[PDB]
A paper describes a structure:
One example is cyclohexadienyl dehydratase (CDT), which is closely related to the polar and cationic amino acid-binding proteins, such as the arginine-binding protein (ArgBP). Like ArgBP, CDT adopts a periplasmic type-II SBP fold, but instead of binding amino acids, it catalyzes the Grob-like fragmentation of prephenate and L-arogenate to form phenylpyruvate and L-phenylalanine, respectively. We previously used ancestral sequence reconstruction to show that the trimeric CDT from Pseudomonas aeruginosa (PaCDT) plausibly evolved from a monomeric cationic amino acid-binding protein ancestor (AncCDT-1) via a series of intermediates (AncCDT-2 to AncCDT-5)40. In this work, we have studied the structural dynamics of a series of states along an evolutionary trajectory from an ancestral L-arginine solute-binding protein (AncCDT-1) to an extant dehydratase (PaCDT).
In this work, we have additionally assessed the dehydratase activity of AncCDT-5, which proved to be an intermediate between the AncCDT-3 variants and the extant enzyme PaCDT. Although the kcat value of AncCDT-5 (4 s−1) exceeds the level observed in the AncCDT-3 variants (~10−2 s−1) almost as much as PaCDT (18 s−1), the KM of AncCDT-5 remains ~15-fold higher than that of PaCDT (277 μM vs. 19 μM). To better understand how the mutations along this evolutionary trajectory affect activity, we also solved a 1.49 Å X-ray crystal structure of AncCDT-5, which shares 15/15 residues in the active/substrate-binding site with PaCDT. Since these active/binding sites are identical, the ~15-fold decrease in KM and ~5-fold increase in kcat of the dehydratase activity must be attributed to amino acid substitutions that are outside of the binding site. Unlike the wide-open crystal structure of AncCDT-3/L188, the 1.49 Å crystal structure of AncCDT-5 determined in this work adopts the closed conformation (a HEPES molecule is bound in the active site), with a Q68-R138 Cα–Cα distance of 2.8 nm (Gd(III)–Gd(III) distance: 3.1 nm). Beginning from this closed state, we again performed triplicate 500 ns MD simulations after removing the HEPES molecule. The simulations predict that the protein rapidly adopts a wide-open conformation, with a Q68-R138 Cα–Cα distance range of 3.6–4.2 nm (Gd(III)–Gd(III) distance range: 4.5–5.4 nm) that is analogous to the wide-open conformation seen in the MD simulations of AncCDT-1, the crystal structure of the L-arginine-binding protein from T. maritima, and the crystal structure of AncCDT-3. Likewise, AncCDT-5 displayed the most prominent distance-distribution peak at ~5.4 nm. The combination of the DEER, crystallographic and MD data for the experiments performed on AncCDT-3 and AncCDT-5 suggest that both proteins predominantly access a wide-open state in solution.
Residue numbers in the entry: 12 to 245
């Protein structure tokens, strides 16, 4: 019945679900430390509340089930607002805009500027399984050969090696991957095919907790805190 704010204050810690697999938002290094834009934002929210932060590992396939099992109070780590997630959770106000856009071999940058160019019988589109990327590919590709590749790290090497031609993912991810792989280039990264918003996942039916988060976030956007963290990571 009581707000999660009460439980957080009594416990003395804010439990933050995060995947640790999405630079620059959230990454868990071998030593077990989390770093990234949303790790720093989580520390700022916890500081506002006067509590310690505890990072709770989750994964994209288990995010919602873990949240419903009360494994954490809020999820922070490059999470897009989606209608599917809104059935089971609320969201904070958004903290940045994103969208899906291609990443290709640099020599192919001009070949794959539009979906009409990509959606052709001989184009080999690769995608990671089970999430918003595969949903996007299957909703927008009627002719291209879609291959699902299971390894979320080595998938980009499929394009480098010439086993695939295009992958469409979050524009922020294409920025990171085109720096990591010199042979790949993000396609019109400032004008993605879709418009999405990143936000923090919150429990339904707790307007007080959501209002606290929204107020902290609005203050951070105008105080210099957001600017500093954004400049460090994005
Ligand atoms: Cl995905």
């Amino acid at each position: 019945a009581a707000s999660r704010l009460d439980e957080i204050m009594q416990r003395g810690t804010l439990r933050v679900g995060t995947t640790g697999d999405y630079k620059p938002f959230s990454y868990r290094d071998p030593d077990g430390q989390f770093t990234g834009f949303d790790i720093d934002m989580a520390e700022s929210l916890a500081k506002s509340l006067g509590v310690k932060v505890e990072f709770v590992p989750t994964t994209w396939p288990t995010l919602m089930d873990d949240f419903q099992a009360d494994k954490f109070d809020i999820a922070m780590g490059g999470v897009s607002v989606t209608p599917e997630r809104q059935k089971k959770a609320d969201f904070s106000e958004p903290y940045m805009t994103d969208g899906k856009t291609p990443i290709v071999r640099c020599e192919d940058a001009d070949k794959y500027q539009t979906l009409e160019q990509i959606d052709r019988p001989d184009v080999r589109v690769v995608v990671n399984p089970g999430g918003t990327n595969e949903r996007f590919a299957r909703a927008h590709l009627k002719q291209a050969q879609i291959t699902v590749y299971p390894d979320n790290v080595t998938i980009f090497q499929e394009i480098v090696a010439g086993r695939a031609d295009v992958m469409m993912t979050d524009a922020v991810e294409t920025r990171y991957q085109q720096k990591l792989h010199p042979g790949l280039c993000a396609v019109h990264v400032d004008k993605p095919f879709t418009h999405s918003e990143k936000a923090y996942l919150l429990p339904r039916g707790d307007p007080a907790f959501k209002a606290y988060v929204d107020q902290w976030l609005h203050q951070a956007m105008q105080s210099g805190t957001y600017q500093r963290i954004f400049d460090k990571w994005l």
